[PDB]
Amino acid sequence: GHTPEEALALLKRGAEEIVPEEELLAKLKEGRPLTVKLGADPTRPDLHLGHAVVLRKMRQFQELGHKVVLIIGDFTRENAKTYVAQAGKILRQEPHLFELRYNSEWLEGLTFKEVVRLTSLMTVAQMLEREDFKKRYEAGIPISLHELLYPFAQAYDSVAIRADVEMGGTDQRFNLLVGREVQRAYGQSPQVCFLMPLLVGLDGREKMSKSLDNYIGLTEPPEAMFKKLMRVPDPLLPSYFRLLTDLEEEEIEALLKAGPVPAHRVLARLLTAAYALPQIPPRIDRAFYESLGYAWEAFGRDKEAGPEEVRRAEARYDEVAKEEIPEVTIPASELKEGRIWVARLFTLAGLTPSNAEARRLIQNRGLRLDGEVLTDPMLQVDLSRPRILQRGKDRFVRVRLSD
Amino acid sequence: GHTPEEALALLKRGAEEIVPEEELLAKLKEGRPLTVKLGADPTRPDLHLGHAVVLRKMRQFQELGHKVVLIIGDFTGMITLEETRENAKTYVAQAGKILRQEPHLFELRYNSEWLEGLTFKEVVRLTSLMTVAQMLEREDFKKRYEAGIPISLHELLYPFAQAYDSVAIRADVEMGGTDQRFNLLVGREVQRAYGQSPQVCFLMPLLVGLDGREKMSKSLDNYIGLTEPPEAMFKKLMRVPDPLLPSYFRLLTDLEEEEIEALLKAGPVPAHRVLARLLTAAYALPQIPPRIDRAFYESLGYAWEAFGRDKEAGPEEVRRAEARYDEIPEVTIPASELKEGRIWVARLFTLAGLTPSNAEARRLIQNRGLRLDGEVLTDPMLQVDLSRPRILQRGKDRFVRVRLSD
Ligand SMILES: N[C@H](CO)Cc1ccc(O)cc1
Ligand SMILES: N[C@H](CO)Cc1ccc(O)cc1
């Protein structure tokens, strides 16, 4: 239900660079399923939101009728299964739209004479042009010669599967272009290079990555993902919405205009819900948001709505939602049907030596709960949210559930 | 009949650099034949004296009981199988003039035998042994990269191919010209990575050509081929630039330093004769002797004492070839001087400046004092044509070339 022009317009959204764009248009006009290539290194099995940027663009190609070929760069079986298992949360898996390949399948048989021919397609000066190599070579940092061979292995993969398009982050620009040169050498139409921007991590400056521990895994439990999303740096909200969701620009502005907290809740709800599912919907947009049960015009104030898995994750967040004031976590086993005796609470926090003493202080108006003078010695409190306990004029302790 | 120390001393003669020299001595004490490697380019089958420098050092290794493994670099060469094989035969045939050929001391191999099958995985492990900065240190690469001259990336794979060849045949020593230094050293690093003792790198100087400036090579036409006719070889050796004599004696013969210094003290020509005789004879044989020294010189029937002058002795070809080896004014005659393409011989000599008048020319002819093209003139009225340049001669030292306009 899309013309070639319409398909291109959709694919361009969020794209960093498509080279050459006019070639993609021509291929989309052919009326056949294009082969979209993505290679992944087995040493990084677990996926995080950063990987979702490129993968969701591939899901879009699939929904448009195109075929994805996921190449595991084993050149293992365990990580492959982990990566493949998680990739399915975003990519469709039917044979007509998805194929799994291991490059050892054809690379292991590549001969020395073939390698000589491949490397002859580039000059030393060209290779040292690649950004990473250039910084290293000028900094006196060693570059093992075998490293210059890898772009040719990745390029040969494009020849092996006759790739029409190859996906990648902006850091993969050089390798994808080598793919075009190698395909030409083998008499194939050179692949369209499709680059997506890199998602910045939770620290707010560096690329999201396992090695930097600034990520959010696709398979982390809902409560943990929701919590992390609620804590993304405000400056990153704009890029997270553009790269992780399909919300329109005006919808994103409206959310921001509503404020930081509302924007975080909508982002946390959208993504926690999407990734809690076996597979994400083809569009993480306003319609999806309302299909969950939330109201767009409520701008995050309707926390009781939504599916139970997301609702509970948000409730867990509100229980611990956060410096001189001492913090103490209360064991869940201390609660009786969601509530706990205020006397016991003051004793556990160390403000009173026993419940009897707590009752005495209450009778003397010496204790406060959330800044309110306690008067009911038998009062029972819930920990749906952190509570500040106070004894006298200068003793404060903030208590909350599970740490 | 040599101790390890004696062996090393002989092998050191003429060498430009042996590294590590202590390792060669160590291997020479192991009481086993060492594998001495030489790689050859199948696109350069014709051999000249320049190749003899490294090949004769290898012959010395053979005479000491060591084994030569000659490797034809057909892998890179074919990157047709017909010419490869033909050239290999050409190279081997000519190399046999210097190298012993029996199995115990010689083995021929083609590196395609093992390189064709090297897997991409093995190539990756191989190239991980050196950095980009390291590679760019090789003579040519460095100059080219700094200047901006293109270097195809595949060129950086060749040193590893040559290095793997040393691993393939477990080389104890690899021979080469001074220009092959970088490649031989990579071979050591690769052998180390493959659990082998690193090969000793044996470098020889590069023989300079007949021009006296550039290295001897086919593409420069300043070479002397090993299979050239004894006559053609003797003549070229007599023409070796004087400054090169010492290096020719040291790199092509085994004459002692004193013998050489004594030969030079005798003069250029004398020195050239001994050299031309020694090499002309040696290379006219089906295979050269183990030592091209005084003993060989005398076994030819020459006297070390007559220093070159002993010119009438020695073998036939040599003595003869040496014999075969052992500015004339021009005057144009205007067509006006001719009559139906002919002129009076008397006037010709006068116009040439060999006689003051035609009358004198006539008297000289009568006294047999004049020659025409080497023949004694006997007719004073002789009519001569200039169908081609003629050589006029008076007495034994007065010559003149006469011809028409041109
Ligand atoms: N260039 C990256 C290597 O790990 C990703 C990759 C891309 C394509 C491939 O065929 C293989 C790997
Ligand atoms: N170094 C020259 C070309 O690479 C010749 C050569 C030397 C050693 C070999 O195993 C092969 C070729």
Side-chain angles (χ1 to χ4, degrees), chain A residues 37-41 71 73 103 154 157 166 172 175:
Chain A
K37 175 196 186 198
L38 174 68
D41 158 14
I71 306 180
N103 54 30
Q154 175 171 353
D157 287 350
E166 171 166 25
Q172 278 280 75
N175 287 352

Side-chain angles (χ1 to χ4, degrees), chain A residues 75 107-108 110-113 115-117 119-125 127-128 137 142-146 148-150 152-153, chain B residues 75 78-79 115-116 118-121 123-124 127-128 130-133 135-136 145 150-154 156-158 160-161:
Chain A
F75 186 88
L107 291 179
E108 259 176 48
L110 202 68
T111 65
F112 190 27
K113 181 183 175 181
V115 176
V116 169
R117 281 166 159 287
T119 56
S120 69
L121 298 167
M122 301 278 279
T123 61
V124 173
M127 298 306 307
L128 294 184
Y137 190 70
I143 301 175
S144 187
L145 188 55
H146 78 95
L148 278 63
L149 296 180
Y150 286 152
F152 294 99
Chain B
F75 183 68
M78 302 183 290
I79 306 174
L115 291 183
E116 238 161 54
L118 271 183
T119 64
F120 184 33
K121 185 180 180 185
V123 174
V124 171
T127 62
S128 71
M130 290 191 92
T131 65
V132 178
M135 296 300 321
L136 296 181
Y145 190 70
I151 299 172
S152 181
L153 182 61
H154 79 287
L156 280 64
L157 296 179
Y158 286 154
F160 292 98

Side-chain angles (χ1 to χ4, degrees), chain B residues 32-47:
Chain B
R32 71 180 175 77
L34 300 176
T35 294
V36 182
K37 173 196 179 197
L38 173 61
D41 182 354
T43 66
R44 253 64 189 178
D46 327 82
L47 310 182

Side-chain angles (χ1 to χ4, degrees), chain A residues 131-148:
Chain A
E131 52 168 51
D132 177 88
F133 289 150
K134 188 181 180 300
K135 299 300 84 176
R136 277 204 272 167
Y137 190 70
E138 301 182 305
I141 302 176
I143 301 175
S144 187
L145 188 55
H146 78 95
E147 298 186 62
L148 278 63

Side-chain angles (χ1 to χ4, degrees), chain A residues 163-362:
Chain A
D164 288 299
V165 182
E166 171 166 25
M167 304 294 308
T170 60
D171 65 302
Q172 278 280 75
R173 189 170 195 285
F174 183 86
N175 287 352
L176 273 48
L177 287 174
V178 175
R180 285 178 58 80
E181 203 58 56
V182 171
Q183 277 184 126
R184 288 194 187 91
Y186 279 72
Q188 281 176 27
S189 172
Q191 57 181 27
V192 166
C193 295
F194 209 116
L195 309 179
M196 300 295 296
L198 289 322
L199 185 73
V200 176
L202 304 173
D203 57 295
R205 308 189 293 290
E206 307 287 77
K207 168 180 184 177
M208 181 175 288
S209 75
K210 142 186 176 177
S211 71
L212 296 177
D213 214 68
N214 59 356
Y215 65 90
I216 300 180
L218 305 194
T219 65
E220 286 190 50
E223 77 107 66
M225 178 178 278
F226 192 103
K227 196 172 179 175
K228 289 183 182 186
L229 289 171
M230 287 302 286
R231 297 178 184 178
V232 173
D234 297 327
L236 293 174
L237 286 177
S239 62
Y240 272 49
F241 276 116
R242 304 201 182 83
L243 302 183
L244 307 176
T245 79
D246 301 306
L247 293 180
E248 307 295 318
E249 282 306 319
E250 65 176 55
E251 301 181 313
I252 295 173
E253 288 308 302
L255 280 178
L256 297 177
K257 183 172 63 183
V261 276
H264 279 281
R265 285 191 186 288
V266 175
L267 173 70
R269 290 174 179 171
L270 281 171
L271 300 187
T272 299
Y275 292 106
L277 300 171
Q279 190 173 74
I280 64 174
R283 300 171 176 182
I284 297 181
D285 58 359
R286 180 178 167 172
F288 173 60
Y289 187 61
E290 302 182 303
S291 79
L292 299 172
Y294 299 107
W296 175 269
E297 282 301 326
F299 291 109
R301 302 188 67 182
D302 60 333
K303 299 187 291 188
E304 63 162 1
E308 292 302 335
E309 212 172 359
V310 180
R311 186 179 179 181
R312 305 203 93 67
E314 179 160 7
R316 290 196 177 71
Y317 171 69
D318 291 333
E319 303 188 327
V320 309
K322 166 186 175 183
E323 201 160 357
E324 178 175 1
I325 299 184
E327 302 280 355
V328 171
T329 70
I330 305 297
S333 62
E334 283 292 323
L335 283 60
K336 178 176 60 61
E337 206 163 62
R339 288 182 174 180
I340 185 180
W341 188 23
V342 67
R344 173 59 172 171
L345 203 55
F346 274 79
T347 301
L348 279 172
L351 287 173
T352 62
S354 68
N355 310 316
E357 182 56 13
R359 300 203 232 80
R360 186 180 77 73
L361 299 171
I362 289 179

Side-chain angles (χ1 to χ4, degrees), chain B residues 175-228:
Chain B
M175 306 292 303
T178 47
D179 56 317
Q180 284 288 302
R181 182 168 173 60
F182 182 102
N183 275 25
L184 270 51
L185 288 176
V186 175
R188 280 174 62 74
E189 287 295 349
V190 174
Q191 276 180 304
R192 225 192 283 280
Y194 279 74
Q196 285 182 27
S197 158
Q199 68 187 8
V200 170
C201 298
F202 207 118
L203 307 180
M204 300 301 293
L206 297 177
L207 193 70
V208 175
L210 296 176
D211 56 296
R213 308 184 296 285
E214 324 280 30
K215 172 201 64 177
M216 183 174 284
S217 70
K218 190 182 184 64
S219 63
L220 292 178
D221 280 291
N222 60 341
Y223 65 94
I224 302 180
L226 299 190
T227 65
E228 278 192 53

